[PDB]
């Protein structure tokens, strides 16, 4: 994978380009069904070991049923949406009268059916575990025929295996208030996730991307609990729909660019605030300042547009022209000179100021480079570890080419007597207006 | 343990002294190994209870193998480092050709061995 990185000395920043995007623009709601059987009484009275075990399993099942019945830097601009809005909407629609009957009647002969609800929504419903099946015709006949005295322990073991999923699901629903994320393996296995992705009415490229990264897709999805009545437990899985695939995406890292004036209290420091990922979608590229919202997996950047911002394409130029008149880059300013480093994808940016000792070393030769004063950049091929002061970082060993694009750091363009050091989200033009 | 505290009214603050420090300055990377066996087919066809159970366990093992194959106030001054930089570096070195062979050959007779990889 021909991944590339650029380091600019003008802002002591680094852009990593050459990724494949996966931008969650929609939500796909699928009604997962577990057909249960509401056992009204477990009237066994035998004190035998097998009877003790089978009554224990029936008691956990009944308590599970009763529990499921009881259940019924730029981040401040992100709009607080309801990640479980679609699932809770479908659940409320299912809470109407006559919806459970349609869900049950549509799945009498098949495993997957599109049901038209009263809201007007057509939902894909799929039975992933028919506990009702195993209980009514495979379990209750044996237990009732032998009068609660199981003859062989294998049936108890297979009852454990089948009821373990229901018990685990009940556990997460109890300790998580009916909303769990990411979707555990108990709610949706990997085979079932692949199958559900394949059966979506979307293009083939989105299918292949999600089929290659089912794990990240599961990490980005939600599970919402819905009705349990009339021998059926339905819950809505809310899967990410990446309406845009294979777009250019680049990550921006920034380090504190501070001056190295001789006087302690008279230096000034600058830092670009728009760090994070930029994934290109249509007219204006998506931006994610919260790195937790993006996941990098084998050069594939999976991110969520709900926790993102929509900006023009000119944000890419924020890396090329810092004084451009068509985009105003955002920065923060301060005067606290602390030396620190950021580990990029293809190297490490080290800002070494004051008397802090900074070195770059590989394990088989010791210290190979001594970082002088300023913001510098070290590659990833020749060095394994970096050390600033007495704190130790390790350089990412990703395979790829890094370009040390030379430049004059912009900090020398400001007068320390005029530098405003009280900004958390600033802009180049408004900082210039502050200077003015 | 002779732990002590001081409260100052001048800043309405409190300092607790008398602790023993443990300051993470380095990372130690150890290669933990689980030797698996890639079963190519589970061709059992019996519908017996024990056969049902054993095929279930073999199927979970095979699906586990397939899944593991598929996987392949002053805080703003803190430098964003890669906490998994050392581990991912060793993993990329292991992804080269001939590294798995060395890891396997070194642990043929013992449980713990120091292996010299191509990175050095």
């Amino acid at each position: 994978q021909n991944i590339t990185e650029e380091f600019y000395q003008s802002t002591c920043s680094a852009v990593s380009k050459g990724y494949l995007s996966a931008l969650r623009t929609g939500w796909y709601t699928s009604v997962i069904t577990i057909e249960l059987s509401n056992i009204k009484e477990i009237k066994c009275n035998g004190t035998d070991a097998k009877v003790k075990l089978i009554k224990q399993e029936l008691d956990k099942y009944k308590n599970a049923v009763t529990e499921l019945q009881l259940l019924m830097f730029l981040g401040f601009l992100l709009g607080v949406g309801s990640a479980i809005a679609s699932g809770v909407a479908v659940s409320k629609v299912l809470h109407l009268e006559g919806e459970v009957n349609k869900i049950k009647s549509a799945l009498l002969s098949t495993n997957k059916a599109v049901v038209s609800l009263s809201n007007g929504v057509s939902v894909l419903t799929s039975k992933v575990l028919d506990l009702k099946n195993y209980i009514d015709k495979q379990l209750l006949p044996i237990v009732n025929k032998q009068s609660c005295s199981i003859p062989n322990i294998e049936t108890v073991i297979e009852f454990q295996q089948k009821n373990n999923r229901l018990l685990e699901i009940t556990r997460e629903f109890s300790v998580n208030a009916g909303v769990t994320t990411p979707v555990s393996t108990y709610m949706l296995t990997n085979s079932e996730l692949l199958s559900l992705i394949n059966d979506m009415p979307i293009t083939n490229d989105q299918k292949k991307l999600m089929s290659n990264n089912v794990q990240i897709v599961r990490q980005q999805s939600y599970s919402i609990m819905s009705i349990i009545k009339e021998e059926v437990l339905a819950y809505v899985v809310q899967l990410p729909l990446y309406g845009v695939i294979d777009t250019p995406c680049w990550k921006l890292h920034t380090s504190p660019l501070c001056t190295t004036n001789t006087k302690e209290g008279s230096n000034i420091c600058l830092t670009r605030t728009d760090r994070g990922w930029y994934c290109d979608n249509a007219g204006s590229v998506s931006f994610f300042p919260q790195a937790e919202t993006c996941k990098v997996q084998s050069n594939r950047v999976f991110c969520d547009t709900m926790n993102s911002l929509t900006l023009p394409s000119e944000v890419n130029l924020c890396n090329v022209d810092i004084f451009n008149p068509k985009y105003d880059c955002k920065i923060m300013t301060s005067k606290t000179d602390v030396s620190s480093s950021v580990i990029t994808s293809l190297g490490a940016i080290v800002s070494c100021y004051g008397k802090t000792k900074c070195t770059a070393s590989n394990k088989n030769r010791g210290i190979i480079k001594t970082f002088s004063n300023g913001c510098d950049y070290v590659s990833n091929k020749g060095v394994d570890t970096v050390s600033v002061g007495n704190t130790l970082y390790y350089v990412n060993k990703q395979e790829g080419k890094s370009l040390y694009v030379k430049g004059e750091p912009i900090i020398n363009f400001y007068d320390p007597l005029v530098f405003p050091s009280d900004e958390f989200d600033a802009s180049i033009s408004q900082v210039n207006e502050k200077i003015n | 343990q002779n732990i002590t505290e001081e409260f100052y009214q001048s800043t309405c603050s409190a300092v607790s002294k008398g602790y023993l420090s443990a300051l993470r300055t380095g990372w130690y990377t150890s290669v933990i190994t689980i030797e698996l066996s890639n079963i190519k087919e589970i061709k059992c066809n019996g519908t017996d209870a024990k056969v049902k159970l054993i095929k279930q366990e073999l199927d979970k093992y095979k699906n586990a193998v397939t899944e593991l194959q598929l996987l392949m106030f002053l805080g703003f001054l803190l430098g964003v480092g890669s906490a998994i930089a050392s581990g991912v570096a060793v993993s990329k070195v292991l992804h080269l050709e001939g590294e798995v062979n060395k890891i396997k050959s070194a642990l043929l007779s013992t449980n713990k061995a120091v292996v010299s990889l191509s990175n050095g």
């Epitope: 002969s109 495993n111 059916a113 599109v114 038209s116 057509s122 894909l124 028919d130 099946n133 009415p201 | -």
Partner: antibody, heavy 121, light 112 residues
Framework: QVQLVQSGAEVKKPGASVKLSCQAS????????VSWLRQAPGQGLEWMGW????????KYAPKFQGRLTLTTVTSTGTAYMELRSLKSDDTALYFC??????????????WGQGTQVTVSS | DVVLTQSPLSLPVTLGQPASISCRSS???????????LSWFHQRPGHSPRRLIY???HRDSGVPDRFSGSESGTDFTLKISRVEAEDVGIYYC?????????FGQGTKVEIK
């Protein structure tokens, strides 16, 4: 009350193509798909292919790959099936039936009366 | 592909008596959830076939009391409570879990 109506009979020489129609009524076609089946005089039924009107996913039998292509028209709720390489094994009655929108067990609830296509020289 | 064998292939029956049609699979038809899918279809001469049983021991809409069939493990059954003069035709069994969806050969049923 579900209805599937098929076109009239047809006669063709070997080497031509066959395009058959199956018009649905009485239900939301878009929530289901259609499987096409064949019934030649003297033999049973053969599943030729299934195509969903919901997602467009389609699957053909191995014996029929290289000759079959199915096309759904949702504007009027009709199925169309194209087969090529006509030989004596094409004189048969062709049957329409409904099926789930996704890869799952087949329902095959309602069937159309069939369209008869005969080949000869 | 799983091949389904029907038994028998010719069914001469007397009016009012029961009838039996068995379908036997070559491999397990149990899906991921646990549902075993075998369906039965009745075709009268000159007309299209009509679904009769959709899941094992599940009667279909409009199917009269005379029809039922239930079996587990490897075999599946079609039991006619009382054959009438309207039950002439041919019956097919069908699996839906494995691709391609294979039918049976079909047994003809006439009144003696």
């Amino acid at each position: 009350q579900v209805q599937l109506v098929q076109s009239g009979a047809e006669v063709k020489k070997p080497g031509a193509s066959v395009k058959l129609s199956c018009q649905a009524s009485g239900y939301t076609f878009n929530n289901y798909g259609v499987s096409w089946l064949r019934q030649a005089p003297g033999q049973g039924l053969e599943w030729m292919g299934w195509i969903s009107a919901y997602n467009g996913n389609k699957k053909y039998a191995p014996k029929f790959q290289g000759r079959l292509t199915l096309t759904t028209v949702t504007s009027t709720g009709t199925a169309y099936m194209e087969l090529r390489s006509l030989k004596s094994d094409d004189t048969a009655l062709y049957f329409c039936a409904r099926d789930p929108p996704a890869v799952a067990a087949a329902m095959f609830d309602f069937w159309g009366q069939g369209t008869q296509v005969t080949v000869s020289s | 592909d799983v091949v389904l064998t029907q038994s028998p292939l010719s069914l001469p029956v007397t009016l009012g008596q029961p009838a039996s049609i068995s379908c036997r699979s070559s491999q397990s038809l149990v899906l991921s959830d646990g549902n075993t899918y075998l369906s039965w279809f009745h075709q009268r001469p000159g007309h299209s076939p009509r679904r009769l049983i959709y899941r094992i021991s599940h009667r279909d809409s409009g199917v009269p009391d005379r029809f039922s069939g239930s079996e587990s493990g490897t075999d599946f059954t079609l039991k006619i409570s009382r054959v009438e003069a309207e039950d002439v035709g041919i019956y097919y069994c069908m699996q839906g879990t494995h691709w391609p969806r294979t039918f049976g050969q079909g047994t003809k049923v006439e009144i003696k």
